[PDB]
Design a protein around this ligand. Structure first.
Ligand code: ZN
Length: 643
């Protein structure tokens, strides 16, 4: 497996190698290879069901395959069929995967939980719903023993002990060691998860007759060694404090025949473990570092129980995107009770009514049309066929996500239109070799933010097109309702207004929040048009929540470095919260070290709460305006979040 963005689709094109398709062709080939390819494809599907959906290519080995005649041939878990959409190109099978929709409670998509469990007679793996319930419940035999201590066991002595919740008979295979190592994780996991029961290797399970193995190949020493190894190597988890170890006991019940010993019956007694025990790491995957990565048992078990954090501590908050109706990688979104919900923000920033085609930014489309001549003609030409939708403009859409603005890009237009794929229009003053690259990367990052961060469950593709002002998805991906583009815009409001809140990242895992109208206004303002601004006093964290994003914008637009964005803030909690952040935004230095040091290379400066600047320290405004105006490249930006 790998991850390829080189494909025309602006998505996560997992290259799953070459498969051999066709049901009959599946039946008439190597079953080992069939299972290998099926497992690889399901690996890729489980990877894309978490990461945010994408594509799976496959170089078909079958010459003359046809998706209408020969079928597919893939054996797929039943829950992994509501998401896959298959397709064929002349020599490439494609499988388009949407998100996971956190359907039926389970947060992430799992192939198999590998949390075995023993029912009345059989050891079955807990499905994802059972495993989630089982973790949620652990977080919040005298007769078989008498048999266990028995010394003499004669051949074919029919045991009075029947298979039950606490016993299990497993006959010996050809290789006793290989078979016991293959079966021990299973039964040990089963017993530890359940009330805890014994297991006897070497005795038939239905007739319950002592058989054992021949002594010529078995060695009790190496057997016990391998058993304790493969029993302590089991990936376990622990919701408790002591963190004990798997407390088992092993015994070799003797085996006699006509008064002559001929083998043993490996009797293993596993006690009820206080925490979950796996047979190996869960078979769940994701796409990380642009490759496939198996979620670690600790992260798997802390993700399956990543319930929406209890907002009972702060009864003033209100939840708006629960993780029970979102994607795997989404986070909840709480808003103050008085601040507007997600629905009002959607209907205010991106209205939807089918009588015409409107523009989300009236002032951005207007100023762009009053400045550039011909932009109005190009937009009215491209926007002519579509009758219902909304065209949204942004001085450069790559910046509103977090990417890096390019040179020679007039503006970016996204059109949300029902009954057709949403279309991204990127308008260039001049054609070059970066048109396609920039458009595809902006569209790909936009879809990723809409799915992962925004939490869009249904199918979503953003079609990128470039126009110099001077592929094909299946029918499923084409919108079909006016009640799903409403979901797309309720997710876009989150993508363009969501920030990782600081108030509640102590209240749980992590909880996003929504900027007000004034903060998004002051953020959307063009920097290359306004390199100097004095902001009215912002109540509460106004300036901080805004500055932490204005600095990312400053780094992206001006191609500046984090080391050239000075952040002059006084309060020490602000200093630690901004500096010790993992993203390395700026250099928070107080007013004292501001005027007690020389900044030779600082280009952009953002000041916080100039109301506390003492005059005896020095006339800060002159020095600041000097160091910005005389910056290395051009007049630097100067934002003073005074009150
Ligand atoms: Zn424990």
């Amino acid at each position: 497996l790998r991850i390829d963005v080189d494909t025309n689709f602006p998505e996560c094109v997992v290259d799953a190698g070459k498969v051999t398709l066709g049901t009959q062709q599946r039946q008439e080939m190597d079953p080992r290879l069939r299972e290998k390819q099926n497992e690889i494809i399901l690996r890729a599907v489980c990877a894309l069901l978490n990461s945010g959906g994408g594509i799976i290519k496959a170089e078909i080995e079958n010459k003359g395959y046809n998706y209408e005649r020969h079928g597919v041939g893939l054996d797929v878990p039943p829950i992994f069929r509501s998401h896959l959409d298959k397709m064929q190109k002349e020599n490439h099978f494609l499988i388009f995967v949407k998100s996971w929709n956190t359907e039926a409670g389970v947060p992430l998509a799992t192939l198999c939980s590998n949390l075995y469990h023993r029912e009345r007679t059989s050891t079955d793996v807990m499905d994802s719903q059972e495993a989630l319930a089982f973790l949620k419940c652990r977080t919040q035999n005298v007769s078989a023993a008498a048999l266990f201590d028995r010394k003499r066991l004669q051949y074919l002595e029919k045991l009075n002990l029947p298979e039950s919740t606490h016993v299990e008979f497993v006959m010996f295979s050809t290789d006793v060691s290989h078979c016991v190592k293959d079966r021990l994780p299973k039964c040990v996991s089963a017993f530890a998860n359940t009330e805890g029961g014994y297991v006897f290797f070497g005795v038939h399970d239905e007739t319950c007759q002592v058989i054992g193995c021949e002594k010529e190949k078995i060695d009790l020493t190496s057997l016990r060694a391998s058993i304790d190894g493969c029993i302590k190597k089991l990936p376990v988890h622990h919701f408790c404090t002591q963190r004990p170890e798997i407390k088992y006991v092993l015994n070799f019940l003797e085996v006699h025949d006509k008064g002559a010993l001929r083998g043993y019956v490996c009797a293993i007694k596993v006690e009820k473990f206080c925490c979950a025990v796996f047979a190996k790491v869960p078979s769940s995957w994701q796409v990380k570092d642009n490759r496939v990565r198996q979620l670690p048992t600790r992260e798997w078990t802390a993700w399956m129980m990543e319930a929406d954090p209890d907002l009972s501590r702060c009864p003033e908050m209100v939840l708006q995107l629960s993780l029970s109706s979102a994607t795997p990688r989404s986070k909840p979104v709480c808003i103050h009770k008085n601040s507007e919900c997600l629905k009002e923000q959607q209907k205010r920033y991106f209205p939807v009514f089918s009588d015409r085609v409107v523009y989300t930014p009236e002032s951005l489309y207007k100023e762009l049309f009053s400045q550039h001549k011909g932009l109005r003609d190009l937009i009215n030409t491209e926007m002519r066929p579509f009758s219902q939708g909304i065209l949204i403009f942004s001085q450069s859409w790559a910046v509103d996500l977090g990417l890096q603005e390019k040179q020679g890009v007039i503006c970016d237009a996204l059109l949300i239109s029902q009954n057709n794929t949403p279309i991204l229009y990127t308008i260039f003053s001049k054609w070059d070799a970066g048109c396609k690259g920039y458009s595809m990367i902006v569209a790909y990052s936009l879809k990723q933010k809409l799915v992962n961060k925004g939490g869009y469950t249904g199918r979503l593709c953003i079609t990128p097109l470039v126009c110099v002002l001077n592929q094909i998805y299946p029918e499923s991906y084409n919108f079909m309702t006016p009640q799903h583009m409403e979901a797309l815009l309720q997710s876009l409001v989150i993508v363009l207004l969501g920030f990782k809140s600081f108030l509640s990242e102590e209240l749980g895992s992590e909880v996003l929040n929504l900027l007000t109208n004034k903060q998004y206004e002051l953020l959307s303002k063009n920097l290359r048009k306004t390199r100097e601004l004095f902001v009215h006093g912002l109540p509460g964290s106004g300036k901080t929540i805004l500055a932490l994003r204005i600095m990312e914008k400053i780094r992206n637009v001006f191609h500046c470095e984090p080391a050239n964005i000075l952040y002059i803030c006084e309060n020490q909690p602000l200093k630690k919260l901004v500096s010790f952040s993992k993203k390395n935004i700026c250099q928070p230095v107080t007013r004292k070290t501001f005027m007690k040091n020389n900044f030779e290379h600082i280009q952009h400066i953002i000041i916080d709460d100039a109301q506390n600047f003492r005059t005896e320290d020095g006339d800060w405004y002159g020095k600041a305006k000097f160091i910005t105006q005389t910056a290395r490249d051009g007049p630097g930006v100067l934002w003073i979040f005074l009150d």
